[PDB]
Amino acid sequence: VQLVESEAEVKKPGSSVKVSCKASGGTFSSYAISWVRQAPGQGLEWMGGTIPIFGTADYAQEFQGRVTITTDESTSTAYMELSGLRSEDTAVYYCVLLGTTMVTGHYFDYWGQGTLVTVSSNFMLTQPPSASGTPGQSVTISCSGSGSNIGNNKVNWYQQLPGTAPKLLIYSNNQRPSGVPDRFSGSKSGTSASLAISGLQSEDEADYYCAAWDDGLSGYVFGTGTKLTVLAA
Numbered sequence: 175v176q177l178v179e180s181e182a183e184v185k186k187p188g189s190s191v192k193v194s195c196k197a198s199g200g201t202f203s204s205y206a207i208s209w210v211r212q213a214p215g216q217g218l219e220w221m222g223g224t225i226p227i228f229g230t231a232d233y234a235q236e237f238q239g240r241v242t243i244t245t246d247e248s249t250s251t252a253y254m255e256l257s258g259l260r261s262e263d264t265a266v267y268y269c270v271l272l273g274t275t276m277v278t279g280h281y282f283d284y285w286g287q288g289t290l291v292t293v294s295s296n297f298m299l300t301q302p303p304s305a306s307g308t309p310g311q312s313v314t315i316s317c318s319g320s321g322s323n324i325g326n327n328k329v330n331w332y333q334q335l336p337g338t339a340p341k342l343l344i345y346s347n348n349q350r351p352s353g354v355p356d357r358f359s360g361s362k363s364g365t366s367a368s369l370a371i372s373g374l375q376s377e378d379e380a381d382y383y384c385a386a387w388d389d390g391l392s393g394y395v396f397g398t399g400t401k402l403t404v405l406a407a
């Protein structure tokens with residue numbers, strides 16, 4: 175299952191940009207599509223999403239009246255338009271495919287490699303800025319929220335290696351996608367969630383982000399992100 179995003183673009187301030195996301199090895203109609211951006215060296219920010227079969231969409235509050243998300247069901251293509259562009263809109267804009275796996279019936283998400291848009295703050299869950307350990311140690315990364323988010327909604331965790339798209343590490347608080355080793359585990363209780371990493375390896379050095387829906391915003395919220403350093407000491 176594959177995602178083609180349109181090419182990088184340089185835009186003038188005040189213009190609008192329309193990014194495409196074309197899916198492969200399937201329609202498309204049994205899934206949802208979310209858009210998430212990341213300014214250089216910064217965290218992850220949800221823009222909006224759509225469910226193609228219903229033709230409905232929802233947009234993050236801070237972009238209301240600026241983002242338009244649409245879908246062409248026949249061609250398996252989703253589009254995000256952002257108008258009134260400014261410097262602050264410089265970012266990598268990611269297409270995310272999400273829903274339920276055929277047969278096994280569990281959650282999955284897949285991120286595209288993103289489209290760089292170059293031109294010319296929002297609620298986030300709380301995470302420590304950094305963590306560290308040496309090979310073979312354990313570490314825990316915390317994520318604090320409130321009733322309307324972590325308290326009532328499923329927490330996901332994402333791993334971001336430098337120069338790569340985020341990747342799903344934990345879903346539904348504590349479930350591991352196939353391919354993620356058992357030394358990663360997730361937990362949540364009340365308004366807090368935690369990612370535990372056993373048997374630390376140098377390749378685990380990355381940024382880790384927790385995330386959940388927030389009932390008050392009616393939008394998806396990411397944590398501030400934690401840079402994990404593995405000290406080959």
Ligand SMILES: Cc1ccc(S(=O)(=O)N(C)CC(=O)N2CCN(c3ccccn3)CC2)cc1
Pocket residue numbers: 206207208209210220222223224225230231232270272283387394
């Ligand atoms: C009327 C209407 C239509 C469509 C949408 S929606 O596409 O935003 N959506 C399915 C909500 C939702 O539960 N998400 C989307 C955000 N999520 C994301 C987004 C990015 C990465 C991971 N997870 C999953 C939960 C909301 C309302």
